[PDB]
Design an enzyme around this catalytic site. Sequence first.
Site, mmCIF file in Angstrom:
data_model
loop_
_atom_site.group_PDB
_atom_site.id
_atom_site.type_symbol
_atom_site.label_atom_id
_atom_site.label_comp_id
_atom_site.label_asym_id
_atom_site.label_seq_id
_atom_site.Cartn_x
_atom_site.Cartn_y
_atom_site.Cartn_z
ATOM 1 N N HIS A 41 13.570 -0.057 -9.955
ATOM 2 C CA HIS A 41 13.617 -1.396 -9.373
ATOM 3 C C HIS A 41 13.264 -2.511 -10.368
ATOM 4 O O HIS A 41 13.256 -3.682 -9.982
ATOM 5 C CB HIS A 41 12.813 -1.463 -8.054
ATOM 6 N N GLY A 143 3.044 -6.870 -10.273
ATOM 7 C CA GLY A 143 2.914 -6.497 -11.676
ATOM 8 C C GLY A 143 2.334 -5.095 -11.897
ATOM 9 O O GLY A 143 2.457 -4.571 -13.005
ATOM 10 N N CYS A 145 3.471 -2.332 -10.403
ATOM 11 C CA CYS A 145 4.487 -1.297 -10.196
ATOM 12 C C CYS A 145 4.689 -0.472 -11.476
ATOM 13 O O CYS A 145 4.698 -1.037 -12.568
ATOM 14 C CB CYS A 145 5.796 -1.892 -9.685
#
Lengths: 300, 300
Positions: A41, A143, A145
Amino acid sequence: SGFRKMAFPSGKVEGCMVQVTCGTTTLNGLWLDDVVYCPRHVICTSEDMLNPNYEDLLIRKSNHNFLVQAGNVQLRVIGHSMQNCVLKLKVDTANPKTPKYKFVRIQPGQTFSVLACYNGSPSGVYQCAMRPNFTIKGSFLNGSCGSVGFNIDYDCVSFCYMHHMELPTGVHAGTDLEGNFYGPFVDRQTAQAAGTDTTITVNVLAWLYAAVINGDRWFLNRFTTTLNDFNLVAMKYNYEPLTQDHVDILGPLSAQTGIAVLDMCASLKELLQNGMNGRTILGSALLEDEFTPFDVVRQC
Amino acid sequence: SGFRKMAFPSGKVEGCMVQVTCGTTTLNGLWLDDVVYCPRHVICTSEDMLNPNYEDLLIRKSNHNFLVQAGNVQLRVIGHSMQNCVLKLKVDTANPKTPKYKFVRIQPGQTFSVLACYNGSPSGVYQCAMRPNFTIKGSFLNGSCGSVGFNIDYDCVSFCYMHHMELPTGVHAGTDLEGNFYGPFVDRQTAQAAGTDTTITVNVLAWLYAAVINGDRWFLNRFTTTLNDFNLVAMKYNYEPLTQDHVDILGPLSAQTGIAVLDMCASLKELLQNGMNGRTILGSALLEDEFTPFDVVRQC
């Protein structure tokens, strides 16, 4: 001795954390050998996340669209691919700080340490459990992830988790390092639901053994019980059903404390049926299910 | 987002942990520049610990009596001294992995990360608070003595604590890195007593702000109160008295949540007077006092 929730030392993993950017989107990656692993993603905008076709989004991207930054120093991307929900960016440089490592798919009820990151910088470490519904209850801002979970044995790091998303309910979902989600979750911004979160019974029993060892044992009773009859009570309080596997795993703790597993199950039964009545066990006013039997042994 | 007890990443400190042996006695040391810091009780046997004269015990020891091992590799000891309750062993080699560091004496109610060790090997990391009676509630087996506490800011490590002992009551005492004990404790095996352990009020308020931010706010009430009248209730429940200093430290959290400090004090008052009634706040059935206002901001 005393008894704390305790993460593994994080230094071996600190040396593998990098930033990956692709468009605006920046997130954390893991640099192992000449490969960077991150959530796929990273190629999405906020708009794309409603209904992303990951094939077609990735097909627009070439090698040079990915900006991998390791501290001050940029890596050259010489190959990209998508394995399940992870992106595998092949880079020029082997990581000098690569530890001995494996990738492991853990089972629900197992615990691990999480290093929470922001722009490839570690900020915090904590110990957590994979819940029976395959969620975790974590701390993950924007941030974070591609923040990672691990266990350490000897000087082998076993990487078991990569953070992908916060679900509408504020709990967390993610993948193994092969990019398969834990649970039925998908990497898209839709209404997704976890099942009923049950309590991890064997972990509770382990913690009660830890309590006994430390001198907390007001909760020890006269009664005993059966596996069968214990589980009927477990059903009513949303505890996971206990198996013979579980009994066997508790055998070392049984041996050390002089208390049989079924006698401990009877203690627990009465705490379920009567509550803790305002008292605490190892400074807690609830039953803790976030230590495995192995963790209690490691610490004790 | 979610909310966890969170240690600093420990890698900078892992690189400074060593083993120190002197007789049978082995314990952990901290190698910074060309100096090893460890508890002076490494020179004692179990017999000596009843009534040790540290001058006279140390006077028997020369430089070669101390065996400093860093992983596989032994350091040469070219100088020893005692500063308060720490031993400063001067070594030949500067530590290559020395971070930027300072030594800081923290105040009660401040938090830090602990790296728990065994024979110069890190095994675990957790976040804790210095209690108002200068004790900590830790995890420390035999061999952990000289395990260290720290905060990290930028890439400066501020070393604030070295573990020396478990008191008869199972709580923990130790020094700063200048070797002054926190509290009235001495490094001897006598019956020593901590005062009444009070709750760190400002940390509780900080945690309630963290709860509000995360969407837990059943505990928010209609009432407000005064500083003066809040403290009368605080006295009765063994809470630390709240000051104007404390109010000011909460001002950023006040600004973010739209709730005034005295309105939060009124929420707390009612939780003290009525209890939590079986409900939880951020998954806890007790009031947590182990996050400072700074910690809540850092995490939020």
